[PDB]
Structure formats: C-alpha cells, structure tokens
C-alpha cells in the first residue's frame, strides 16, 4: 500500500592508464654493447611495441565508446525547477571553474627510465561535458533523445511514462507529488552523505589504480636485480671483467630483463582484457539504463528500474540508480475468478482482492481498490470448469443508465 524510492550507486571501471615502454632505453639505456647484443635475439621489440600500441588503441576505443553515445551536446536550462525535484547535487555548478558536479568533485577528491605515460585522448573536461549532456538529455527529453531528435517532454510526463512502463497505471503519482519529491531529495541527500562515508565504497577504481602503479613499480624495481651476475650495472661489468665473462653476464642480465618485460606485457594484456570486458558491461548499462528503461529485474539497482543518471569519474564511471521498492505491505484474501449469472469473470489487468466483506479490483503493485465493473472485466467459458471461483455480483452501468 506504499512505495519508497531508494538510490543505489554502482561503480564500473572504464579505462586504465596507457603505458608505453622503450626497448633499448629500459634494457640498455646508454651502453652500445647491449644495443649490439640485443640484435642477436631477433625481433623481440617490434612485437611488444605493437602489443602496447594495440592495448592503447583498445583503451582509447573503450573510453570513447562508453560516453560518446550522442551526436549533440545538450544544454541544461538555467532554471532548476522541475516540479519539486531538487536536481542540484548532480547538475554542473557554474561557481566552480572546472564544470564539476558536487558528486563528481566528491568522488574525484576520494581518488588518488624508459617508462613513459601516454595521456588519454579524453581528459576530465570533455567527459564531464559528455556526462552533463547525457544528464540534460535524460532530464528534459526523456528516453526519446537516445533514438532520434530530442522532444521537449516535461519531467512529470516522463516519470509518469516510466511508472506506466513497469505495470503501474498513472493514477498514483499526481496525488502525492510533494511526498515523492521529498523522498527523492532525501535519497539524494543520504547517498551524497554516505558516498564518502566509507573508504571502501570506491573499491574498483582504487584497486585498478593501485594495481597499475604497483605494476609499473615492480617493472622499475627489476633494474636493481643482479640476475645471477656480479652486479646490476651495465658500465660496471664491461669496465672491470674479462669480455668473454662479461658476455655471459650481460647475456644473463638481458634475458632476465626480457623475461620480466614479457611477464609485465602478459599481465598488462590480461588486465586490459578485463578492463575491456568491464567497459563493455558498463557500455551496455549506459546504453540501456540511461538512454531508456530496462525491464530486467536486478540489473540496475535492487528493485524496479525507473531511471538512472551518469556521473564522470576518472578512468571509470559511477551510476546513480533510482529504484522502486514497494515496502509496507498489507495482505488480503483473493479468488481467481468471480461467478455471476452462470458465467465466469476475469480481471483485465489486475487481481480480485477482498478485504473480508466486499470485493475489489486493484493494480498488481499498489492497493487502489475499485468496484468490479464490466468495462475492465471479460467473460470466458462457464462457472464449472474454473476452480476456486466465488459467488459475487458485478456492477454494470447500463442498469442505472437505461431507467434514468
């Protein structure tokens, strides 16, 4: 007999930091003897370079395909009134010069030789503009803007359409619009307060950033390894040892460094494949739970799906799911059919619900009792083949209509 909207947030990583290495600089650096010896191994640098460039191209494609789902940047109107719904914690604020939402600022404040770092094609400003454009399109145009041209649809109209899309008729929202607006504002306030309450909330982005940096580290730390040789310095072995012995020592050092580099490339490839799979899942959720309404249960939030909003997050994304939890239930007694004048009666879309004395028909998800009438009921068969039937009368408007 009541509904409570709860806001749940989920975090899905998008793209991790692109990494490019140099073969001669990391392996040799300055010694030309190592550069001459590296040619004896064959082509073990072009393959790694092609692999890392392919990984970088795949990650750029991953971070491009999850946000660039529209061809027009939509502008939020300067007025911020939508019918009692405070939308101030996720819309961009002109006071901050970074065009950053308070949610985006809060999540951004909670995220902390031969190894060059390629910056991403998409920095924070363009992805913030993409998230702002998608938020504007989903707040002023409904789900229509993800199909063709944007149509000016009011926010109460689109939330009534979303209520009609989950099997609840649009005769329950407009009676308590202030209550549902207050519930939405309280949900936004509590999710803003509890987003930074626990340090383990932003687990996945912190985990992948930790894994990456440490990965590079371990790759850097291998330069100070003896690898079974006398020392770990290229100039020290060549200027002190007999050159046949230095040949074996440098050979062991270079093959150890090549094994470490191959292990790092394999680890980066596995991590990039996992990031690509997570980005594909995030793109599916972006193209389904933002550009439209999904009828899949427990796919976006714990409850019935209404709408969701995207927020920009460095090297990732966090969704703000808006659910529909019908708590505070109350049970009654029912019957599958009603017998009247020897013929069975069936509900068109609801269920026959009795409170003990009389009988009523109501929707499948809200207790709104209505009198049984012939307009929303249909007859089929007889009263004998159907089991569990009860005897009751049905109201028909023609009986008081004709004699009047």
């Amino acid at each position: 007999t009541n509904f409570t909207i709860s806001v749940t947030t989920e975090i899905l990583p998008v793209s991790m930091t692109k990494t490019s290495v140099d073969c001669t600089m990391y392996i040799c650096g300055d010694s030309t003897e190592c550069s001459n010896l590296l040619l004896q191994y064959g082509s073990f640098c072009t393959q790694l370079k092609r692999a890392l460039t392919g990984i970088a191209v795949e990650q750029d494609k991953n971070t491009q395909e999850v946000f660039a789902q529209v061809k027009q940047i939509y502008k939020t109107p300067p007025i911020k009134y939508f019918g009692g719904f405070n939308f101030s914690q996720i819309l961009p604020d002109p006071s901050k010069p970074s065009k950053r939402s308070p949610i985006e600022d809060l999540l951004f404040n909670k995220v902390t030789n031969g190894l060059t770092v390629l910056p991403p094609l998409l920095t924070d400003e363009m992805i913030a503009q993409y998230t702002s454009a998608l938020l504007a399109g989903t707040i002023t145009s409904g789900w229509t803007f993800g199909a063709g041209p944007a149509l000016q649809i009011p926010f109460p109209m689109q939330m009534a359409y979303r209520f009609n899309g989950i099997g609840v008729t649009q005769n329950v929202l407009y009676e308590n619009q202030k209550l549902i607006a207050n519930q939405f504002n309280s949900a936004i306030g509590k999710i803003q307060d509890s987003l930074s309450s626990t340090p383990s909330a932003l687990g996945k982005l912190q985990d992948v950033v930790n894994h990456n940096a440490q990965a590079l580290n371990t790759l850097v730390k291998q330069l100070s390894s003896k690898f079974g040789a006398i020392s770990s310095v290229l100039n020290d072995i060549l200027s002190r040892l007999d050159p046949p012995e230095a040949e074996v020592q440098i050979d062991r050092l270079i093959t150890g460094r090549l094994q470490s580099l191959q292990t790092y490339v394999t680890q980066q490839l596995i991590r990039a494949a996992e990031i690509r799979a997570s980005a594909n899942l995030a793109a599916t959720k972006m193209s389904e739970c933002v550009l439209g309404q999904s009828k899949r249960v427990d796919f976006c939030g714990k409850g019935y799906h209404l709408m969701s909003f995207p927020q920009s997050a460095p090297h990732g994304v966090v969704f703000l799911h808006v659910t529909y939890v019908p708590a505070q239930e109350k049970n009654f007694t029912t019957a599958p059919a009603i017998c009247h004048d020897g013929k069975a009666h069936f509900p068109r879309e609801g269920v026959f619900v009795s409170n003990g004395t009389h009988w009523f028909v109501t929707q499948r998800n809200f207790y709104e009792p209505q009198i049984i009438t012939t307009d929303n009921t249909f007859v089929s068969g007889n009263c004998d083949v159907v089991i569990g039937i009860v005897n009751n009368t049905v109201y028909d408007p023609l009986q008081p209509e004709l004699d009047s």
Binding site: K75, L118, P119, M126, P149, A150, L151, Q152, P154, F155
Partner: protein
C-alpha cells in the same frame, strides 16, 4: 612524446609538442587521435581542439509537449 622541445610552426600540447602543423581557433571533427583532445587532420596539416558535437540547445516547458 612528453618532451619540452626547447633544446631541439611549433605548437605545445599536453602530450608533448607538435612540429609541422599550425593551430586553428575553430574546432572541426577529427579522425586522427593524439591525446589531451588536440586532434590533427588535413584540410596543409592543421591541428585543432576536438569538436564536442553539435551545440544543440533544446527548450523545456512543464506545460508543453512535442509529438512527431
């Protein structure tokens, strides 16, 4: 890649510095990626900031509707 070329038309980006291309005030749609949203194309070879898309502004009225 990430070199402040003060010891080697020169334009400086956040991914490094570019030699051989000029800068354009207006933004076009690019196909060659570089990094930090500074694309390059061939109209000579020009470099420009990326176009975010069409700057389409839609109105909104709680009393209005649009039906195709």
């Amino acid at each position: 890649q990430g070199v402040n070329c003060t010891e080697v038309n020169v334009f400086q980006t956040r991914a490094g510095c570019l030699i051989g291309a000029e800068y354009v005030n207006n933004s076009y749609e690019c196909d060659i990626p570089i990094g930090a949203g500074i694309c390059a194309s061939y109209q000579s070879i020009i470099a420009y900031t990326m176009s975010l898309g069409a700057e389409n502004s839609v109105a909104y009225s709680n009393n209005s509707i649009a039906i195709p």
